[model samples]
Target chain A: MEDENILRNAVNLQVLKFHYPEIESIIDIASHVAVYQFWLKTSIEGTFFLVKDQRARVGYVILNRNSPENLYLFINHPSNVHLVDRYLIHRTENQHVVGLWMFDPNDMSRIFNIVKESLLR
Target chain B: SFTNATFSQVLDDLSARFILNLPAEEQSSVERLCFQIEQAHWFYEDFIRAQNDQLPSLGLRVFSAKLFAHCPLLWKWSKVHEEAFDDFLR
Candidate 1:
């Protein structure tokens, strides 16, 4: 239980606002993350945070890297199977978009919530 | 909560945090795999750019085949990427 709390608090917008800057990002960094090669054109710009580990990119985030009031959060989660019943299809074949909230940098809670979800892995 | 200016920088950071912990001999193999993961990300980018119906864009299948032997879970099957690559073929 104690470990859970520690991980939860790590998702704070105060730090994330600066940590995950605009233009391209989700990353739950794991061990063995080396400075190697990477290519763009994977996702759109104005995106922030890449939640990846040693082998693959498990999740990602699209924030106000270019604009304000638009926030997107995705997770490569097992719960994604439910998305099929919905018509909007927010979740994709691989990326299960958990939610898209309106972003306001001024709202500390907003960023905190987003960060929390990202760390839920 | 920090962002790397480049993918290379980000990979460097993660390697130190995650990969460095492994025994000495395993480092080189891990680094090579990381490099492959990074390139796979690019293969899709090239397909997205400068699209033309008549022109052919690179495919992820080959790239996927190459990287899968090392780490199978890194690349998520993507619709954006799927359509993007498909657009190239059409």
Candidate 2:
């Protein structure tokens, strides 16, 4: 009997987990950033770019303190690390980068050059 | 080809279409709620105003509920209000 009840619970959990693992994070980030008021607009405030991938439980949140030119990016998944780093390298000065991926510095420069295209105009 | 419409456009258009399809009395009630939102937030006057910002539909719905449920402003708002909005959509 206990096993039956636990199995039912597990079924429900699986359904919920598969549907929206990132929705809670999406709502949290929206409210945290007060997205309704300041999103992409100049307020007594800042800007936020929130991209929640529809297919994956991964997203990127780029927020600026009080100016749009100065942006800080936060990605919720490891896969997006290289994606952003390559795109934002020269357009945005990189300092205080904190992550892991062992690659030789010269080879790394060539790897960086591999991705050079503007997106989402 | 896909339309170049902004995401806010898509979300807002969907929600606005929803409100339009509601029965007369229910539509009035939602409009009244929009007026109330304007009173509380000042930057907006109705359901459509939220689109002026890039806020997602769900974000505005929850935020509007929070405007009424004052106690849980500490990010611990009740599930009641969340479901209340859900019922509106349902």
Candidate 3:
């Protein structure tokens, strides 16, 4: 599917690191084999993606189906939002599934605000 | 014990203090962080329940280490608790 291509491309372009090193190791192992089988038992599923640029290796975006909020969490720096947005749109038909509940822009913005506020506090 | 009083008053107090203190934007991030924290707590609680022994202080240490391994930024911010955490480990 086109979405699969978008995911592939976005992952390749982004260099999203897992917040947890153990998670990174787990994902690395899954990506090579039995990703679906692993997901059957785990709540988290991840896909690697690349950007249109193709030269850049974007990184990974993980979806947590068992997340109470049914959200997608990106481990990349907040600055990567633009790329993430584009990739999400490319994957979804109307971009409706890509918003706050699924992927919250405000969450990243809050982190930015907190970091800024901390500097002043 | 576990009563409406605990759920609505004590537990609510804890949740509100932690959740309300978070900025709206950071709420999701904090929610994710707290989810993992609660999971760790439950893991230890279950261990205690099943084993009938208190978890060692090292349990928290290992939990925190694993959390930090996932989020390196946490380790950087840990200067705030560096002394206390190390002291606890000792």
Candidate 4:
């Protein structure tokens, strides 16, 4: 529980907005969701944040490098299995995605919900 | 010219030059295999360097054959451009 909270708090809306100038538009990052972090074979640490909007579209935000140097956002839907290789596909086994929602990254409370998710099986 | 390029960068360029230009649906899988080949090359070079403190006159066939010993997938994929891969390693 302590470790979980530490990991979750390590990456939040403020940290993301500060590091990535492109995501300043997100209004509010819901506090209920959990943020996950992963490390690469080369020992590079990366943070994973999942966002689900009102319409059920999901966006996976992967932030890597110490103090956040590189950020990647991969948006996908459950229906498209062909696009599976583009992002880490193992995370969506249970979630049902009807379509993709174009969430406004700058402001999230308006139409999005921060969700606890997983990718690594 | 590729002095600062990462393996992914070089992989993309080389794919265009050799593999994907001809075109096929299995492009992603091809890239995955090529990435593993580079990984095999790294491990092979590291092992050789640790043993001799240097890499001796290594030929493409010899190296690919070594890769085949452990990973036939990589050997089969990289066999398409033996010399090109050899040049890329250097």
Candidate 5:
């Protein structure tokens, strides 16, 4: 698959292998969500995950080209998912990728709460 | 005016506090900007406080407005003298 090839080439396998278990732990904690990687362009890839640390910090991901996604993904796991989501879809037309990957029905309540809080902020 | 000894002591304390909080990789960038700002004598009383408080956006807005208002000469000089300030700020 073209997308798989993109992931294989763009991703640092050694780094991903090292970090995979930790990433899985991040996913397991969320229980209802999973994280995956897909390439949007040669240099750009998207990563989104659901997290449940305090009141389900779902939709914690980043779609930037240059930075390592681990630390930012971890930081956004708590209260910054909305910010990441906003940035991800700002220039892009398709919201389905983000919606399907990041938001699931079990976690929609948490996602809506975050959206409300962000609106207030 | 404060004695040179008092000024040096205050600067030393500020330096120690700032350096302790920064990661090793970031220390050099922070130190270089500190020297550049100090050399320009851009002393604002709340500079350290604003940085320590993690109010960079607010601090920068105030710094930009104040620099233009108080130090028009320095501000004009900055166009040529501190052309790289924008890069460092980001």
Candidate 6:
């Protein structure tokens, strides 16, 4: 009952609208979220937020001031530390990948490589 | 696709978009935003006019979003107006 009450208050109503165990697996794994505002031609778009994934939550995008290269991607995936060599550069307490700005927005491949490497889904 | 026509045209297109996408209950709020955004025309025109810089794809092709990142006038317009409006707005 205690756990039930806690979940009743804490849970997102929309989540239960879907089936569960599926939801459980999803909550256990994936997280996509509103990350940034992607500018388009002439003016800006309202806001572009993608699915809330682990990187969107556990990971953070850092701006590297004064560096020729800026906007580094940092994430923690102990299970997939091995793939870091292919998808990332710059090492802090975690790994740093290139900024999305450098590549074309269409270049989902590079990020997907990172995503597949780090994906909770 | 602005940087070609006057700002009014741009506002017209945006107003159309807001009306089309948002329900009427929200139309006035977004319409007000359309008007609110009109003030930034001066700053917008200044950037659009300059050449030799990272301009748009062409006269009206102005789709280089990445460029605005380096140039941050920080419209913060959402907070300045939208918030107050959304209090009654959204």
User: Which of 4 and 6 is ahead in TM-score?
Assistant: 4
List fnat, each candidate. 0.11, 0.00, 0.00, 0.00, 0.00, 0.00
- Stretches > 4 Å off in candidate 3: A1-60, A63-91, A94-96, A102-121, B1-61, B65-73, B85-90
Q: What level of docking quality does candidate 3 show? A: incorrect
Give lDDT tens digits, candidate 6, residues B1-87: 333544334333322222112222333454454443342333244443342134333322132122223222211312234345335
lDDT of the structure predicted as candidate 4 = 0.35
The residue pairs that clash in candidate 4, if any, are A25-A106, A25-A107, A26-A106, A26-A107, A27-A107, A27-A108
lDDT string for model 6 (A85-113, tens) is 22223233533323223222332444445
Stretches of candidate 4 off by over 4 Å are A1-11, A21-45, A52-57, A66-68, A80-87, A90-121, B1-90
Note the clash tally of each candidate.
Answer: 23, 0, 22, 6, 0, 10
lDDT of 1: 0.32
Question: Model 2: which docking level applies?
Answer: incorrect
Candidate 2 vs candidate 5: the DockQ winner is 2
What TM value does chain A in model 2 reach?
A: 0.22
lDDT of 2 by residue, A4-106 (tens): 3354234323222233234222311111122211113222222122333445333323222222222323443332335233122222233333331212233
Locate the minimum summed-lDDT window of 10 residues in model 1 chain B. Answer: B71-80
- Model 1 alpha-carbon miss at residue B57, Å: 5.2
Off by over 4 Å in 6: A1-46, A49-121, B1-26, B52-90
Q: Which ranges of candidate 2 are over 4 A from the true structure?
A: A1-27, A34-52, A60-121, B1-40, B46-90
Reference-based lDDT, each prediction: 0.32, 0.31, 0.30, 0.35, 0.32, 0.29
Best of the candidates, TM-score: 3
> lDDT per residue, candidate 4, A1-121, as tens digits?
3753343233344344443434432322221111222312222223344543334444544333222233334345333222121222223445522222222232232223232221111
| Candidate 3 C-alpha lDDT tens digits along A1-121 | 3753344223322222222221221122011100122113334322222111122222333322222111223323323332243122112333322222123444334433432332232
TM-score of 2: 0.22
> Which candidate number would show the highest lDDT if scored against the true structure?
4
* Preferred candidate (DockQ higher): 3 or 6: 6
lDDT of 1 by residue, A1-121 (tens): 3753243224322233343444233333221111101221222322233444334434443332222222334445434423222111235574433332212222223333444565465
